[PDB]
Structures are given as C-alpha cells and as structure tokens.
Amino acid sequence: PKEPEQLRKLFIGGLSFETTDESLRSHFEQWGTLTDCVVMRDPNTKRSRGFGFVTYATVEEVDAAMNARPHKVDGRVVEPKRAVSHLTVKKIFVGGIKEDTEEHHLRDYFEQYGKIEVIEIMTDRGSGKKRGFAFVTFDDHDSVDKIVIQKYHTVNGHNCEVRKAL
C-alpha cells in the first residue's frame, strides 16, 4: 500500500535556469527512488521557470531529502518544500490539551518532528489558569509541514487539534 502521491512530492524552488530534468534527478536520487522529476519550463521558449518537482517512492525518502538540506543543485542553493495540503511557517497551534498538559509533554512529542525553539502554554490573563492550548515554534518549516498532514496527534493522552499558526 503506497502513500498518496501528494505526500511523496517535493516542490523545488530557486533552481538554476540551467538545471534539467536529468540534473535535478541525478541530484535528488541520492536520497531515494524518484518516480517523477520535472523542471518547469515556458511552453514557447523552453526557458526554465526556476522551479520544479520530484516525487519519491516513499515518505521516508522525502524525509531523507529534507534532512539533507541545504541542497546545492547545479551550483545554486534551492528551496524544497512538501506539496500543499504553500503557507510556510515555523509555528503551530496545539489545541485540546486541557489543564494537565505541561511543557515536557509537548516537548517530548514534538521534538521528533524538528528542533523546538519556543513552547508557549497559554494561560488566562486574569486567573493564570491553563486555557487548554499551546503554541510550539520550530527552527524550520518542514517540522510544521510534517505535523499538519498527520490525521492524529496524541499528547498526554489527549487527541489534539494541530494547525499552522500565523
């Protein structure tokens, strides 16, 4: 059973105009099997539009490619991003954590998606009581992109609602 193709794609921006289907493929095949690899071009001039996409056989291969950033492809540092589900942010809202979820619950779970820089457990401005949601800020957007395409997040026994924040 193959993961949906949308979740196996990487959009690559900032290409050198000299990058070709073949040179993009040779580069990104270092991190997995590519079922598709396309440089986008003008339909009339054939001049590169400066971006393209690669499709891996598995999500773990996408992860490997993202973990190998920065990618310098044909002399230029490119910008890979997972396909849209792009709203490129480093912060998530985590809701449904109730009053008993602490910083270490959130850290122990989310640190396996990426490097955490800030955890903000929200409290009532008047009483100081926990409001039941939090924000987590990572050092990079791919953490967030992995998180929000999951159907489920279980933290401290709570089924949480997680979305991109600002």
Q: Where are the alpha helices (DSSP H) in 68-163?
A: 103-110, 141-148
Contact assessment for residue 156 and residue 101, using Cβ atoms and an 8 Å cutoff = yes
Give the Cα separation of 58 and 18 in Å (integer). Answer: 28
Is the bond preceding residue 43 a cis peptide, omega within 30 degrees? no
The full 3-state SS of 43-70, as one line of letters, equals: CCCCCEEEEEEEEECCHHHHHHHHHCCC
- Minimum Å gap between C-beta 56 and ligand A1H9W is 22
Give the Cα separation of 69 and 76 in Å (integer). Answer: 12
Please say which residue, 73 or 162, places its beta carbon nearer to ligand A1H9W.
162
Give the contact letters, 8-47, x = binds to ligand A1H9W (CB under 6 A), - = no: ----------------------------------------
Binding positions for ligand A1H9W, 135-164, rule CB under 6 A: 148, 150-151, 153, 161-163
Please say which residue, 32 or 114, places its beta carbon nearer to ligand A1H9W.
114
Q: Which residues face 82 on adjacent strands?
A: 10
- Minimum Å gap between C-beta 71 and ligand A1H9W is 27
Please say which residue, 62 or 78, places its beta carbon nearer to ligand A1H9W.
62
Please say which residue, 37 or 160, places its beta carbon nearer to ligand A1H9W.
160
Give the Cα separation of 145 and 7 in Å (integer). Answer: 10
Amino acid at 56: Y
Output the six-digit token pair for 137: 């800020």
- Minimum Å gap between C-beta 25 and ligand A1H9W is 32
Is 105 one of the binding residues for ligand A1H9W (CB under 6 A)?
A: no
Please say which residue, 107 or 163, places its beta carbon nearer to ligand A1H9W.
163
At 149 the three-state DSSP class reads coil
Please give the residue ranges that form the binding site for ligand A1H9W (CB under 6 A). 148, 150-151, 153, 161-163
